[PDB]
Amino acid sequence: MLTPGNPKWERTNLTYRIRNYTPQLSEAEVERAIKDAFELWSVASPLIFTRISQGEADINIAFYQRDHGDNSPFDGPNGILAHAFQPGQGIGGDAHFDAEETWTNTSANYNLFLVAAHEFGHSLGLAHSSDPGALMYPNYAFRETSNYSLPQDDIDGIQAIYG
């Protein structure tokens, strides 16, 4: 499902920056979750993601609580977990995570890798899917992560935008 107006990135080598972290995972564990979330999309498209440690990146990633400057506030534990902006300059592409969640790398609610993988779909121009097996389904569901691969519906979706 592709977003109304089909916003898409014009370049396929995009940068990202992790602006801050969550105390419930090590910094390394957050960096891995994020790296692997991008790689899912990279191996199904021509997109190549490059991390930068400082300065201005295409996709900023941050953990924030409640009001955090973009007029879409987070809501405390549970409920909304994260959100992401469609491709564009500035805030476009960026992905925010609710700092008040329990973030994990386990089956326990909420696996950061899974949530980030979903948000980056939005960052790249995908909408929600109605397929309950799709990563882009609106509601979180745990799936095994140790050798995770994009569900077929999400491959279909990114290929429709980027080939």
* Nearest to Zn ion of 154, 155 (CB atom): 154
**98 forms part of the interface with Ca ion (CB under 5 A):** yes
Residue 96 binding result from Ca ion, Zn ion, none, given CB thresholds of 5 to 8 Å by partner type: Zn ion
Cα-flanking dihedrals φ and ψ of residue 83, to 5°?
-155, 165
DSSP 2: B
**75 forms part of the interface with Ca ion (CB under 5 A):** yes
Which residue is it, tokens 């295409």? 58
Helix, strand and coil in the chain, % to nearest 5: 25, 15, 60
Instruction: Tell me the window of 14-22, 67-75, 99-107, 153-161 that interacts with Zn ion (CB under 5 A).
Output: 67-75
Instruction: Round to the nearest angstrom and report the end-to-end CA distance of the chain.
Output: 14
Residue among 9, 14, 41, 94 that touches Ca ion (CB under 5 A): 94
Residues in contact with Ca ion by the rule CB under 5 A:
75, 79-80, 92-94, 98
